[PDB]
From a paper:
We found that while [name] encodes the guanylyltransferase [name] (unusual type [name]), which arrests bacterial growth, Rv1044 encodes the atypical protein kinase TakA (unusual type of atypical kinase antitoxin), which neutralizes the activity of [name] via phosphorylation. It encompasses an N-terminal domain (NTD) and a C-terminal domain (CTD). The NTD (1-181aa) exhibits an α/β fold that commonly found in nucleotidyltransferase-like proteins. A large central cavity is formed between NTD and CTD.
To shed lights on the origin of [name] phosphorylation, we determined the crystal structures of a selection of mutants, [name], D82A and E146Q. The mutant [name] served as the negative control as it cannot be phosphorylated. Crystal structures of [name] mutant [name] expressed alone or co-expressed with TakA showed no sign of the phosphate group adjacent to residue 78. The [name] prevented phosphorylation, thus [name] was toxic and the toxicity was not rescuable. In non-phosphorylated form (S78 or [name]) the toxin is active and toxic, while in phosphorylated form (SEP78 or a phosphorylation mimic S78D), the toxin is inactive and the toxicity is inhibited.
Numbering used by the authors: 3 to 292
Write the structure that this text describes.
Amino acid sequence: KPYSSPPTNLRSLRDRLTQVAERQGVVFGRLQRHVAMIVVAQFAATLTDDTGAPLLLVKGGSSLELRRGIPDSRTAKDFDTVARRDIELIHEQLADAGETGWEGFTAIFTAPEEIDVPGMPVKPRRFTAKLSYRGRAFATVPIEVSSVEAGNADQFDTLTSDALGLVGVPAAVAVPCMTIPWQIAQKLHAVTAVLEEPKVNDRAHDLVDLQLLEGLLLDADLMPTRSACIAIFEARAQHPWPPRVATLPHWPLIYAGALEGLDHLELARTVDAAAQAVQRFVARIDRATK
Ligand SMILES: [Ca+2]
Ligand SMILES: [Ca+2]
Ligand SMILES: [Ca+2]
Ligand SMILES: [Ca+2]
Ligand SMILES: [Ca+2]
Ligand SMILES: [Ca+2]
Ligand SMILES: [Mg+2]
Ligand SMILES: [Mg+2]
Ligand SMILES: [Mg+2]
Ligand SMILES: [Mg+2]
Ligand SMILES: [Mg+2]
Ligand SMILES: [Mg+2]
Ligand SMILES: [Mg+2]
Ligand SMILES: [Mg+2]
Ligand SMILES: [Mg+2]
């Protein structure tokens, strides 16, 4: 019943994914996207400095999916990371990792393209990973790499998934991820940000993620989060801490879309209630003391 040998080719891989997807009540395309993300995360995990510490930390929706699993996180598309040092050399190192491969997977990476974010000195970069399993194309993963901000790469959590073990690839998965205090700080900044006039803030989905991250902190002391928040809002030098969690007129349906598949969770069911919940969390963070 549990595959003893790894898949022999892509067809057997997809074949096995579809069976695991139905087996645990998940959409096939999501499980396959999840596996593609894990493969690229394992490439990233081979990148270390000369003391063995990670060079790349995962963040964004990929990290939330690793923390909570597929059923309890939003479906997200990209592989967002923070580069611990020198961003230009990350691409070359990933390309080498993908050429060497991991458990039969290989990757070719497209050229990095800068993107403008006013609050960051060094601009993030975006590119794509073209994944193949035993020579035959498998999936495509959008990748975003941003430079370190304050102490958001000082520490990392190490997360796992058994998805590849379920289709017969047993090699252990261990993914360094940006810690929750810094995820909260950056999402709070993004969801409360006022963009330059032409652009508009669409990030109502961050209201879902912030509720999920708050729940993941359980009873933890909020002082690390408060410090991280203060550090991000000051480094970025835009709107100050603590922010106001305002809702824009087009967010009701964007927030509703972000709830898709999460009916079983205890979440705010309207954007107003979501804004009120995240505003309470902001105040709870601000009250923390050493
Ligand atoms: Ca994040
Ligand atoms: Ca994902
Ligand atoms: Ca810091
Ligand atoms: Ca909590
Ligand atoms: Ca106001
Ligand atoms: Ca609505
Ligand atoms: Mg599951
Ligand atoms: Mg290590
Ligand atoms: Mg994602
Ligand atoms: Mg830690
Ligand atoms: Mg940690
Ligand atoms: Mg799984
Ligand atoms: Mg827009
Ligand atoms: Mg629905
Ligand atoms: Mg409920």
